Design an enzyme around this catalytic site. Structure first.
Site, PDB file in Angstrom:
ATOM      1  N   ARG B 110      28.186  20.616  27.813  1.00 30.92           N
ATOM      2  CA  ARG B 110      27.856  20.062  29.135  1.00 30.92           C
ATOM      3  C   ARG B 110      26.373  19.825  29.428  1.00 30.92           C
ATOM      4  O   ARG B 110      26.031  19.244  30.471  1.00 30.92           O
ATOM      5  CB  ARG B 110      28.462  20.924  30.238  1.00 30.92           C
ATOM      6  CG  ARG B 110      29.924  20.651  30.518  1.00 30.92           C
ATOM      7  CD  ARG B 110      30.409  21.617  31.577  1.00 30.92           C
ATOM      8  NE  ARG B 110      30.637  22.952  31.033  1.00 30.92           N
ATOM      9  CZ  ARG B 110      30.792  24.038  31.782  1.00 30.92           C
ATOM     10  NH1 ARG B 110      30.724  23.944  33.102  1.00 30.92           N
ATOM     11  NH2 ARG B 110      31.012  25.213  31.216  1.00 30.92           N
ATOM     12  N   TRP B 279      31.024  13.993  20.840  1.00 26.94           N
ATOM     13  CA  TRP B 279      30.877  14.170  19.402  1.00 26.94           C
ATOM     14  C   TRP B 279      31.267  15.587  19.036  1.00 26.94           C
ATOM     15  O   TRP B 279      31.437  16.441  19.915  1.00 26.94           O
ATOM     16  CB  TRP B 279      29.466  13.845  18.924  1.00 26.94           C
ATOM     17  CG  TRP B 279      28.393  14.612  19.631  1.00 26.94           C
ATOM     18  CD1 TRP B 279      28.021  15.924  19.410  1.00 26.94           C
ATOM     19  CD2 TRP B 279      27.530  14.114  20.655  1.00 26.94           C
ATOM     20  NE1 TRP B 279      26.982  16.258  20.254  1.00 26.94           N
ATOM     21  CE2 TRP B 279      26.667  15.167  21.029  1.00 26.94           C
ATOM     22  CE3 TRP B 279      27.406  12.877  21.302  1.00 26.94           C
ATOM     23  CZ2 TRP B 279      25.689  15.017  22.017  1.00 26.94           C
ATOM     24  CZ3 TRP B 279      26.432  12.727  22.287  1.00 26.94           C
ATOM     25  CH2 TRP B 279      25.586  13.791  22.632  1.00 26.94           C
ATOM     26  N   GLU B 284      35.066  22.779  15.236  1.00 26.76           N
ATOM     27  CA  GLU B 284      36.297  22.160  15.716  1.00 26.76           C
ATOM     28  C   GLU B 284      37.116  21.699  14.530  1.00 26.76           C
ATOM     29  O   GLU B 284      38.324  21.938  14.453  1.00 26.76           O
ATOM     30  CB  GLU B 284      35.986  20.971  16.619  1.00 26.76           C
ATOM     31  CG  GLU B 284      35.435  21.348  17.973  1.00 26.76           C
ATOM     32  CD  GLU B 284      35.239  20.134  18.871  1.00 26.76           C
ATOM     33  OE1 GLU B 284      36.239  19.697  19.489  1.00 26.76           O
ATOM     34  OE2 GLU B 284      34.094  19.622  18.951  1.00 26.76           O
TER      35      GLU B 284
HETATM   36  C1  HEM Z   1      28.865  15.152  23.914  1.00 26.81           C
HETATM   37  C2  HEM Z   1      29.190  16.156  23.093  1.00 26.81           C
HETATM   38  C3  HEM Z   1      30.311  17.173  23.415  1.00 26.81           C
HETATM   39  C4  HEM Z   1      30.476  18.318  22.745  1.00 26.81           C
HETATM   40  C5  HEM Z   1      29.597  18.821  21.570  1.00 26.81           C
HETATM   41  C6  HEM Z   1      31.614  19.010  23.310  1.00 26.81           C
HETATM   42  C7  HEM Z   1      32.120  20.227  22.905  1.00 26.81           C
HETATM   43  C8  HEM Z   1      33.320  20.754  23.324  1.00 26.81           C
HETATM   44  C9  HEM Z   1      34.129  21.716  22.602  1.00 26.81           C
HETATM   45  C10 HEM Z   1      33.755  22.295  21.215  1.00 26.81           C
HETATM   46  C11 HEM Z   1      35.212  21.988  23.352  1.00 26.81           C
HETATM   47  C12 HEM Z   1      36.367  22.935  22.972  1.00 26.81           C
HETATM   48  C13 HEM Z   1      37.457  21.994  22.463  1.00 26.81           C
HETATM   49  C14 HEM Z   1      38.571  22.709  21.753  1.00 26.81           C
HETATM   50  O1  HEM Z   1      38.347  23.853  21.266  1.00 26.81           O
HETATM   51  O2  HEM Z   1      39.680  22.111  21.675  1.00 26.81           O
HETATM   52  C15 HEM Z   1      35.135  21.197  24.578  1.00 26.81           C
HETATM   53  C16 HEM Z   1      36.036  21.181  25.629  1.00 26.81           C
HETATM   54  C17 HEM Z   1      36.106  20.281  26.683  1.00 26.81           C
HETATM   55  N1  HEM Z   1      35.242  19.212  26.932  1.00 26.81           N
HETATM   56 FE1  HEM Z   1      33.482  18.928  25.806  1.00 26.81          FE
HETATM   57  N2  HEM Z   1      32.108  18.248  24.346  1.00 26.81           N
HETATM   58  C18 HEM Z   1      31.352  17.093  24.435  1.00 26.81           C
HETATM   59  C19 HEM Z   1      31.578  16.071  25.338  1.00 26.81           C
HETATM   60  C20 HEM Z   1      32.497  16.024  26.374  1.00 26.81           C
HETATM   61  C21 HEM Z   1      32.758  14.879  27.246  1.00 26.81           C
HETATM   62  C22 HEM Z   1      32.066  13.489  27.116  1.00 26.81           C
HETATM   63  C23 HEM Z   1      33.710  15.246  28.126  1.00 26.81           C
HETATM   64  C24 HEM Z   1      34.353  14.457  29.299  1.00 26.81           C
HETATM   65  C25 HEM Z   1      33.700  13.482  29.956  1.00 26.81           C
HETATM   66  C26 HEM Z   1      34.052  16.632  27.858  1.00 26.81           C
HETATM   67  C27 HEM Z   1      34.981  17.377  28.559  1.00 26.81           C
HETATM   68  C28 HEM Z   1      35.625  18.497  28.071  1.00 26.81           C
HETATM   69  C29 HEM Z   1      36.807  19.116  28.640  1.00 26.81           C
HETATM   70  C30 HEM Z   1      37.618  18.706  29.893  1.00 26.81           C
HETATM   71  C31 HEM Z   1      37.109  20.297  27.727  1.00 26.81           C
HETATM   72  C32 HEM Z   1      38.288  21.268  27.892  1.00 26.81           C
HETATM   73  C33 HEM Z   1      39.361  20.734  26.954  1.00 26.81           C
HETATM   74  C34 HEM Z   1      40.658  21.427  27.235  1.00 26.81           C
HETATM   75  O3  HEM Z   1      40.749  22.121  28.292  1.00 26.81           O
HETATM   76  O4  HEM Z   1      41.578  21.281  26.387  1.00 26.81           O
HETATM   77  N3  HEM Z   1      33.311  17.066  26.778  1.00 26.81           N
HETATM   78  N4  HEM Z   1      33.961  20.465  24.516  1.00 26.81           N
HETATM   79  C1  LIG Z   2      47.324  22.890  21.302  1.00 28.05           C
HETATM   80  C2  LIG Z   2      46.451  22.583  22.494  1.00 28.05           C
HETATM   81  C3  LIG Z   2      45.075  22.439  22.320  1.00 28.05           C
HETATM   82  C4  LIG Z   2      44.266  22.156  23.420  1.00 28.05           C
HETATM   83  C5  LIG Z   2      42.775  22.002  23.231  1.00 28.05           C
HETATM   84  C6  LIG Z   2      42.418  20.530  23.119  1.00 28.05           C
HETATM   85  N1  LIG Z   2      41.039  20.325  23.580  1.00 28.05           N
HETATM   86  C7  LIG Z   2      40.452  19.303  22.710  1.00 28.05           C
HETATM   87  C8  LIG Z   2      39.112  18.749  23.149  1.00 28.05           C
HETATM   88  C9  LIG Z   2      38.856  18.318  24.452  1.00 28.05           C
HETATM   89  C10 LIG Z   2      37.601  17.780  24.790  1.00 28.05           C
HETATM   90  C11 LIG Z   2      36.602  17.690  23.825  1.00 28.05           C
HETATM   91  C12 LIG Z   2      35.356  17.161  24.135  1.00 28.05           C
HETATM   92  C13 LIG Z   2      34.411  17.101  23.109  1.00 28.05           C
HETATM   93  C14 LIG Z   2      34.698  17.584  21.832  1.00 28.05           C
HETATM   94  N2  LIG Z   2      33.774  17.562  20.832  1.00 28.05           N
HETATM   95  N3  LIG Z   2      35.917  18.080  21.572  1.00 28.05           N
HETATM   96  C15 LIG Z   2      36.859  18.137  22.530  1.00 28.05           C
HETATM   97  C16 LIG Z   2      38.109  18.655  22.190  1.00 28.05           C
HETATM   98  C17 LIG Z   2      44.828  22.018  24.688  1.00 28.05           C
HETATM   99  C18 LIG Z   2      46.199  22.162  24.854  1.00 28.05           C
HETATM  100  C19 LIG Z   2      47.009  22.435  23.772  1.00 28.05           C
HETATM  101  C20 LIG Z   2      48.276  22.586  23.935  1.00 28.05           C
HETATM  102  N4  LIG Z   2      49.413  22.670  24.151  1.00 28.05           N
END
Ligand code: HEM
Ligand SMILES: Cc1cc(CCNCc2ccc3ccc(N)nc3c2)ccc1C#N
Ligand code: HEM
Ligand SMILES: Cc1cc(CCNCc2ccc3ccc(N)nc3c2)ccc1C#N
Ligand SMILES: C[C@H](O)[C@H](O)[C@H]1CNc2nc(N)[nH]c(=O)c2N1
Ligand SMILES: C[C@H](O)[C@H](O)[C@H]1CNc2nc(N)[nH]c(=O)c2N1
Ligand SMILES: [Zn+2]
Lengths: 413, 408
Positions: B110, B279, B284
């Site tokens: 963020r 990115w 991940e």
């Molecule tokens: C720009 C570089 C970014 C990096 C390095 C990054 C990194 C991450 C990582 C590592 C996670 C955990 C994902 C997982 O374990 O599945 C995450 C979650 C999340 N990101 Fe970011 N992100 C980026 C950009 C963004 C953008 C552009 C958005 C939306 C506009 C965003 C919104 C979210 C949301 C909503 C989650 C929670 C996902 C969930 O609840 O499943 N991210 N981010």
């Molecule tokens: C199996 C499972 C996994 C997940 C996490 C997905 N979150 C991915 C995610 C979302 C946003 C991202 C933004 C940036 C980034 N590098 N990776 C990002 C990866 C949620 C719900 C379920 C279910 N059911």
């Protein structure tokens, strides 16, 4: 609250149903609008406060032994009630003490080692009156639990709080820990976690060797008196020099650790009674030493030195030199303990056993409170099964609790 | 009350006032914490939500109670009255989208929140339209390896029967196949989605890394299949800088993580289709995608090649292999000039971000369970950072898979 809460494991799809959370007694710190699950920590009981706490516990004990509603149960309730009425407190039976200690452990949300909860040697030290007597009880505990390397989980319980001005306290955070010394130049010799306690010991008269792994003396308070210093007999202090199975140079780092992790600053609460001195010990999970004690920045902080001896590229973080060194150090810790036949558990085995424990507890007890933030090991989180396991956290009693540091509250005589 | 969060390594203590703003529930109660649980309109409901959002928008541009502020509230009110909904201004849309990211307690990335290219696709009416908008998104965000954060926003929900939905969970993902012998080929996370594509007419290459087609639903209609033009799909061959044998594993991944199944909520409005992308953080792919038992599950194969002793868990053969894999991923992306951040760098940036937010905003909602990387936890600074989790709006929310709700 809902009668049934489900937890899921996202790796196995296994869904468990918790009913035990309905027996939750105290506050987590969270509310409906904010979660404090990563916050480390989010004048005696009056007669009227004490009655229902005692009854709750007594009912629970008698229910556990399948004598709920029995004559012995009703008689015990009556005897306890009369004691509180005439003395403002009560004394637990030995059976109840043992049950309550084992259940404080069973209930400890943050403990990944709880599969062992029913196997706990309980030492009743409620007849202790002096710091010398505490020393004697503590030495016996250390010797029994150490068992020449075949460690045995144990707790020693000193007299309960009365008016709060006669507390028994072990001032040490663990029975065995290494001294830390702050240097005039700002550097730290030994374990930086223990600098404050070390300074107190020195002020109380301890002559410090000023080395890197100096076993601290016991600082023991009995019956609210000023605390006293005692040296633990070194033959009772089992230590393991750390070497590596491949890296011949690893032993040249001169590292070692002690075999017995023995926490001594918690408070045991049973049936509203408060045991402010209840040192307990189990055995180590490797990461406790290999990741936290050795690799935390504010601890021994050895990553750089290991990485240099590993001839790693330490210029970019993306080389993962830290992670690479971290694994080797943890390999070394486990190898050294196993080689000297001192009980230790790796984080894979421990977490797999905890999952089985958790599942069993859900089956037989209707739940198992767990703090994910603490249960998941500090390295390789997602390659352990606990990472994928939803957990519910809540506080059951009897319980182990934190208490303020005794030097902060003690009234010096 | 003011709440304090402490870092146990630096002893820095921040003070959180921002949490007082949240009105949505977290799932926990005074007696039970659900911090590790993954998932804990009408005109009447709609206006206060709209009002709250307009107010914070006009508060954020330093014109609370201005003439424009008053008019907008009035304008929105009339619109909700006479149409049962309302339309965001472009400025509001962009503010709303950036703030959903800013408020995402689970996102370690963020620090970038205000740098987000917003593509307004609210004029879209068909799956073909959606495909066009999506291609442009992928092309723009990919940028030849120099990744740029972006979000494409499709028309908001109306009555629930005419939702726009991207059925894919990410715009780019690999197929998964159930084999006769009960094993899985490719990505097991996508076996179900893959089967739906096959049944809808997709001819599957049956490989280990087959880019899935897009399955796009516009205005509540049946979803339609589209192949992303391959030249738009940037992929990275995974090799190791020391182990020449690593490339023989035949591993690869795609450069663009573009989550496409979330719901974006702004001022009571619901955007059921809002693919967004940034990115990768290396772990991940290197930890979760490659090494989860229920995913590609490569640890054993890699450990073999490293000739490790795999008999006892206490040899930490898994941990060793895990580090090497993540080294490969980072090296591969970097060598190919494709944007990627390591978990040390990312978590470090996150701490700085937290500092920024406490200073200018009064706090930062954060989910420690998600923020701490799935490897080497305590050697990253976030492990030692106390965090407060709470739900602020605008937000990204989960929504059910479209195939559990849709009628054909
Ligand atoms: C720009 C570089 C970014 C990096 C390095 C990054 C990194 C991450 C990582 C590592 C996670 C955990 C994902 C997982 O374990 O599945 C995450 C979650 C999340 N990101 Fe970011 N992100 C980026 C950009 C963004 C953008 C552009 C958005 C939306 C506009 C965003 C919104 C979210 C949301 C909503 C989650 C929670 C996902 C969930 O609840 O499943 N991210 N981010
Ligand atoms: C199996 C499972 C996994 C997940 C996490 C997905 N979150 C991915 C995610 C979302 C946003 C991202 C933004 C940036 C980034 N590098 N990776 C990002 C990866 C949620 C719900 C379920 C279910 N059911
Ligand atoms: C028998 C082998 C045992 C193992 C492998 C084990 C493992 C662990 C570990 C790894 C932690 C996290 C400690 C930290 O990161 O600081 C922990 C916490 C804890 N353990 Fe266990 N433990 C064992 C025995 C015991 C016993 C015998 C008791 C009490 C009777 C106990 C009660 C607790 C409590 C109360 C905590 C929370 C500590 C805190 O909040 O500071 N454990 N345990
Ligand atoms: C910085 C800090 C750390 C801690 C953890 C101590 N707890 C260790 C502990 C407790 C019980 C254990 C039982 C077995 C075992 N192997 N290790 C065990 C380790 C508590 C309070 C603060 C503070 N402030
Ligand atoms: C900030 C965070 O709550 C704190 O660093 C916790 C995280 N999880 C932990 N888990 C264990 N087992 N031991 C710890 O000391 C901590 N520290
Ligand atoms: C059960 C637990 O909540 C679940 O496995 C979570 C743990 N933390 C996570 N953290 C991140 N970043 N991503 C995840 O998918 C998960 N999974
Ligand atoms: Zn909580």
């Amino acid at each position: 609250c809902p009668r049934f809460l489900k937890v899921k494991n996202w790796e196995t799809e296994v869904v468990l149903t918790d009913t035990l959370h309905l027996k939750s007694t105290l506050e987590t710190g969270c509310t409906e609008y904010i979660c404090m699950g990563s916050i480390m920590h989010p004048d005696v009981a009056t007669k009227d406060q004490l009655f229902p706490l005692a009854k709750e516990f007594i009912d629970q004990y008698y229910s556990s032994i399948k004598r709920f509603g029995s004559k012995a149960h009703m008689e015990r309730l009556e005897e306890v009630n009369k004691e509180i009425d005439t003395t403002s407190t009560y004394q637990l039976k030995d059976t109840e003490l043992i049950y309550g200690a084992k259940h404080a452990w069973r209930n400890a949300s943050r403990c990944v080692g709880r599969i062992q909860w029913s196997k706990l040697q309980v030492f009743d030290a409620r007849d202790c009156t002096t710091a010398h007597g505490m020393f004697n009880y503590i030495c016996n505990h250390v010797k029994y639990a150490t068992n020449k390397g075949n460690l045995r989980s144990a707790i020693t319980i000193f007299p309960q709080r009365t008016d709060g001005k006669h507390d028994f306290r072990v001032w040490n955070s663990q029975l065995i820990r290494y001294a830390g010394y702050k240097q005039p130049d700002g550097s730290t010799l030994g374990d930086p976690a223990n600098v404050q306690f070390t300074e107190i010991c020195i002020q109380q008269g301890w002559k410090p060797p000023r080395g890197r792994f100096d076993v601290l003396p016991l600082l023991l308070q009995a019956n609210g008196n000023d605390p006293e210093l005692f040296q633990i007999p070194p033959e009772l202090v089992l230590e393991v020099p750390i070497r590596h199975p491949k890296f011949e140079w690893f032993k040249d780092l001169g590292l070692k650790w002690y075999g017995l992790p023995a926490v001594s600053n918690m408070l045991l609460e049973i049936g509203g009674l408060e045991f402010s001195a209840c040192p307990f010990s189990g055995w180590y999970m490797g990461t406790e030493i290999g990741v936290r004690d050795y690799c935390d920045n504010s601890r021994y902080n050895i990553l750089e030195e290991v990485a240099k001896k590993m001839n790693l590229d330490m210029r970019k973080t993306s080389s993962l030199w830290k992670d690479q060194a971290l694994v080797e150090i943890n390999i070394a810790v486990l190898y050294s303990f196993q080689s000297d036949k001192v009980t230790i558990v790796d984080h894979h085995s421990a977490t797999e056993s905890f999952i089985k424990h958790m599942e069993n507890e859900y089956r037989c007890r209707g739940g198992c409170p767990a703090d994910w933030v603490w249960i998941v090991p500090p390295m390789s989180g997602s390659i352990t099964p606990v990472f994928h396991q939803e957990m519910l956290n809540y506080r059951l009693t009897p319980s182990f609790e934190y208490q303020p540091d005794p030097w902060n509250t003690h009234v010096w005589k």
